[PDB]
Amino acid sequence: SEVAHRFKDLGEENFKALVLIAFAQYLQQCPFEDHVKLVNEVTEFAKTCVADESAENCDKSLHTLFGDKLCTVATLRETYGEMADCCAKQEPERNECFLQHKDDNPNLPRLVRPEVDVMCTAFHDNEETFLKKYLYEIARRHPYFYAPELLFFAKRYKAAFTECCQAADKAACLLPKLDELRDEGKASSAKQRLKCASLQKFGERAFKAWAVARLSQRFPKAEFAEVSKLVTDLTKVHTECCHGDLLECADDRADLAKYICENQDSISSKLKECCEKPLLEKSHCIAEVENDEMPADLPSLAADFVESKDVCKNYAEAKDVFLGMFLYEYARRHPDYSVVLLLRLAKTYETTLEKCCAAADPHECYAKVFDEFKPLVEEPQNLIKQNCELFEQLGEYKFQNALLVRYTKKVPQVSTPTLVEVSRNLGKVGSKCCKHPEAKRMPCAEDYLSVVLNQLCVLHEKTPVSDRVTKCCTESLVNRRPCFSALEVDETYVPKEFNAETFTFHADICTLSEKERQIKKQTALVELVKHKPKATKEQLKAVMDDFAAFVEKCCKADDKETCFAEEGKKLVAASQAA
Ligand SMILES: CC(=O)[C@]1(O)Cc2c(O)c3c(c(O)c2[C@@H](O[C@H]2C[C@H](N)[C@H](O)[C@H](C)O2)C1)C(=O)c1ccccc1C3=O
Ligand SMILES: CC(=O)[C@]1(O)Cc2c(O)c3c(c(O)c2[C@@H](O[C@H]2C[C@H](N)[C@H](O)[C@H](C)O2)C1)C(=O)c1ccccc1C3=O
């Protein structure tokens, strides 16, 4: 019995919370109330199997039980449309159907907080129901959210309200925390979307390589066999979470934090204080722990991998394990390299072996590989350098605006809200990474951009419109950033039809937050580029500046919405005459 096994390895609180997430990530259109009853019904049954592992259906698979429980409310095609299809299937076909129906952008209501005095009251009234809804609303909007990590997020939300609802100035305590958890949450969701994308689109091998490179960078004093062991365990964890095996994922992940903290002396010195924290807090700290000092007593790759005469032997002997050792050794010595770069080098190395180890004289043939590594390394370095400079002169907002015009020109068929959001999240690389020195920039930036671009890939995957996006998003996982970077302004693209319904603003814009008002003006910028690309450049900054003054003025115009109309028509007229 697994339902019993999982119930007692996790405890009732996390068991009930993980079934709720699992249900909310599969049926994202179901109301909270419906999900709760289903979870509680399962939770009852789970306790039946704990008391007697030999009872009724206690020996069924987790997915059969949860799937049967889910399809009690799902088979209603009236409300959920083409998801009653999945409930007609049996396991494991049902679960695969559920996985392929996860929606990365459902038509769900915007989530706007009520007042602080309203929020704090509700938290105190029913605490558990309050937090269940948190899990509910994030999981239905983020169907790939790292589930065990979401439990940690609910814990921190629980703390914030418990603290700030009994503060002198409740709002001043609460809002910074709620904002910090919101942003930190999205970051977590995005990273995990990339992890799941690798597993499902590119396979186990692709993820394992990523895991080797990252863990080796982080545990460079750890022996190869240790990193490899950790890799296997980390890979099983995310394979389960991306495959909807949330309970097994959470259980195996708790086990992994356990192994690490026990064998701390053979992994990393930066793990003390992490292994002293409680369950969720410990697992969270380890995953994003600081990189360890690399051993100052360390030889050169060139000897073992390109100067040895036994490379071609050691390679063909164990192809993946040999390439693993190379990546490990190369990554361990380079926390200043992005994970993707390190993987590009491993492939470059792999391809030059495939060629030379079959050549007549293998040794002379691959005696130049590190010369291939050179432009691979310098290209991102310059990109990070060039973009960081641009960031300093523009600032976050104007920096996004540039990338927004840059990416609208690369891939103009892509929907506007997707262009606005992705360009923004891209532009946030400037604040996030440009503070660091060159020794910490490439990993911070390029791996971040890879995360953001994966969102582009999956928000576009749903309803494809651009060949170039589809292309970059399929041809590799590792070359995505330079593929998108290499894109030039689409010259085959035919300028969109002009419109009046997409440029004239309303007085409600004065009631929105600074973030929303930015998105409004940025949305209109995307459209404008989609309409008039060609040589358009600083004329845009001229039209963009005319927005701000127009909005600033007309919001303080004591208008009857006419200020937004009279210059609303005046803006367009001056724009046309170019
Ligand atoms: C009806 C009910 O069960 C509760 O809805 C749940 C709830 C909640 O879970 C959260 C919130 C709520 O305001 C409410 C309440 O709704 C509103 C509407 C009710 N009719 C009533 O006005 C009540 C005071 O607040 C009450 C939040 O504001 C919230 C904010 C940030 C993270 C999680 C959250 C978060 O999780
Ligand atoms: C009854 C119900 O199910 C509630 O859905 C739960 C809920 C919630 O779970 C969250 C939130 C809610 O506002 C609400 C409630 O707001 C409702 C009622 C409020 N009075 C207000 O009208 C809001 C716009 O809708 C609706 C959040 O705002 C929220 C913000 C940030 C992270 C998580 C959250 C978050 O999780």
- Residues 230 and 160 grouped into a single domain: no
Burial of 117 (0-12, 13-18, 19+ CB in 10 A): exposed
- Give the distance (Å) from ligand 2 centre to CA of residue 152: 19
Q: What is the DSSP string of 80-100?
A: H-TTTTTTTS-TTHHHHHHHH
Pair 142, 214 in one domain: no
* 361 domain residue, yes or no: yes
Containing 231, the helix (H) or strand (E) segment is helix 224-242
| 114 CA to centre of ligand 2 in angstroms | 8
For 499-519, b/e burial (b = at least 16 CB within 10 A) is eeeebebebeebeeeeeebbb
484 and 497 in a single domain? The answer is no
Largest Cα separation within the chain, whole Å, is 83
Among protein residues, the one with the nearest Cα to ligand 1's atom 30 is: 113
CA distances from 256 to 151, 235, 279, 288 (A): 17, 11, 11, 14
Interacting residues of 563 by C-beta distance below 8 A, sequence separation 6+? 507, 553, 554, 557
366 Cα: distance to centroid of ligand 1 (angstroms) = 63
The position carrying tokens 């959920």 is: 80
Residues with CB under 6 A from ligand 2: 32, 111-114, 133-134, 136-137, 182
* Cα 134 to ligand 2 centroid, rounded to whole Å: 8
Q: Which residues are annotated as a binding site for (4Z,15Z)-bilirubin IXalpha?
A: 236
Helix (H, G, I), strand (E, B) or coil at 125: helix
Distance 161 CA to ligand 2 centre (A): 14
**Contact assessment for residue 533 and residue 489, using Cβ atoms and an 8 Å cutoff:** yes
Contact 280/159 with Cβ under 8 angstroms? Answer: no
What's the rounded Cα separation, in Å, for the pair 210 and 35? 36
Q: Could you say which of 359, 378, 397 is where a domain stops?
A: 378
Mark whether 407 and 452 lie in a shared domain.
Answer: yes
Ligand 1 centre distance from Cα of residue 21 (Å): 18
Residues 85 and 142 in one domain: no
Distance CA 493, CA 500 (A): 22
DSSP state of 264: G
Residue whose pair of structure tokens reads 């990338």 in the numeric block: 403
H helix or E strand, kind and range, residue 392: helix 369-410
Nearest ligand to the CA of 130 is 1
| Type of residue found at 131 | L
Please choose, from the candidates 204, 289, 262, 267, the residue with its C-alpha nearest in 3D space to the C-alpha of residue 238.
204
Among protein residues, the one whose CA lies closest to atom 6 of ligand 1 = 130
**Would you say residue 129 lies in a domain?**
yes
The answer to whether residues 145 and 82 belong to one domain is no
Place of tokens 């360390």: 298
**CATH code, domain carrying 349:** 1.10.246.10
Contact call for residues 561 and 533 (beta carbons, < 8 A): no
CB crowding 22-61: b at 16 or more within 10 Å, else e: bbbbbbbebeeeebbebbeebbebbebbbeeeeeeebebe
Cis peptide bond prior to 92, omega within 30° of 0: yes
**Statement to judge: residues 313 and 324 lie in one domain:** yes
Taking the CA of residue 134 as reference, the ligand 1 atom at the shortest distance is 36
Binding-site annotation, residues for Ca(2+):
2, 9, 240, 245, 248, 251, 255
- Number of separate domains in the chain: 6
Give the span between the Cα atoms of 558 and 5, in whole angstroms: 66
The length of the chain is 578
Residue 226 lies in a domain: yes
3-class DSSP assignment, residue 173: helix
Pick the residue whose CA is nearest to atom 18 on ligand 2.
Answer: 114
DSSP-derived secondary structure for 480-533: HHHHHHH----SS---PPP-STTT---GGGGSS-HHHHHHHHHHHHHHHHHHS-
| Pair 563, 484 in one domain | no
Q: Which atom of ligand 2 is nearest to the CA of 32?
A: 3
Q: For residue 183, how far is its CA from the centre of ligand 1 (angstroms)?
A: 20
CA–CA separation, 334 and 376 (whole Å): 14
Residues 227, 127 share a domain: no
Out of 34, 111, 142, give the residue to mutate to test ligand 2, the one with the largest number of ligand atoms within 8 Å of its CB: 111
Q: Is residue 577 part of a domain?
A: no
Ligand of minimum distance to the alpha carbon of 128: 1
CA-nearest of 256, 23, 285 to 155 is 285
Residue nearest to atom 34 of ligand 1 (CA): 134
Report d(CA 2, CA 259) in Å as an integer: 22
Last residue of a domain, one of 330, 353, 378: 378
One domain for residues 391 and 362: no
Burial environment of residue 376 by CB neighbours within 10 A (0 to 12, 13 to 18, 19 or more): middle
Sign of the CA dihedral running 508, 514, 516, 521: positive
φ, ψ for residue 186 (rounded to 5)? -55, -45
Q: Which of 110, 112, 117, 118 to mutate to test the pocket of ligand 1 (most atoms within 8 A of CB)?
A: 118
Ligand 1 cavity residues, CB under 6 Å: 113-114, 118-119, 121-122, 129-130, 133-134, 157, 178
Tokens 């050792």 — which residue? 325
Which of 216, 211, 218 has the alpha carbon at shortest distance from 237?
Answer: 211
Do 118 and 89 lie in a common domain? no
**Last residue in a domain, options 292, 315, 334:** 292
The residue range of the domain holding 425 is 379-490
Tell me if 280 sits within 8 A of 152, measured CB to CB: yes
Q: Is 275 helix (H, G, I), strand (E, B) or coil?
A: coil
Handedness of CA 468, 470, 475, 481 (dihedral sign): positive
Do the Cβ atoms of 384 and 341 come closer than 8 Å?
no
Task: Give residue for tokens 């959210």.
Answer: 145
* Residue 233 belongs to a domain: yes
CA of 111 to the centre of ligand 2 (A): 6
Residue with tokens 């330079």: 482
563 domain residue, yes or no: yes
Annotated binding-site positions: 2, 9, 63, 236, 240, 243, 245, 248, 251, 255
Identify whether 578 is part of a domain. no
236 located within any domain: yes
Give me 378's structure tokens: 């310098």
Same structural domain, 495 and 478: no
Q: What is the DSSP letter of 578?
A: -
Please give the distance, rounded to the nearest whole angstrom, from the Cα atom of residue 119 to the centre of ligand 1: 6
> Are the C-beta atoms of 108 and 28 separated by less than 8 Å?
yes
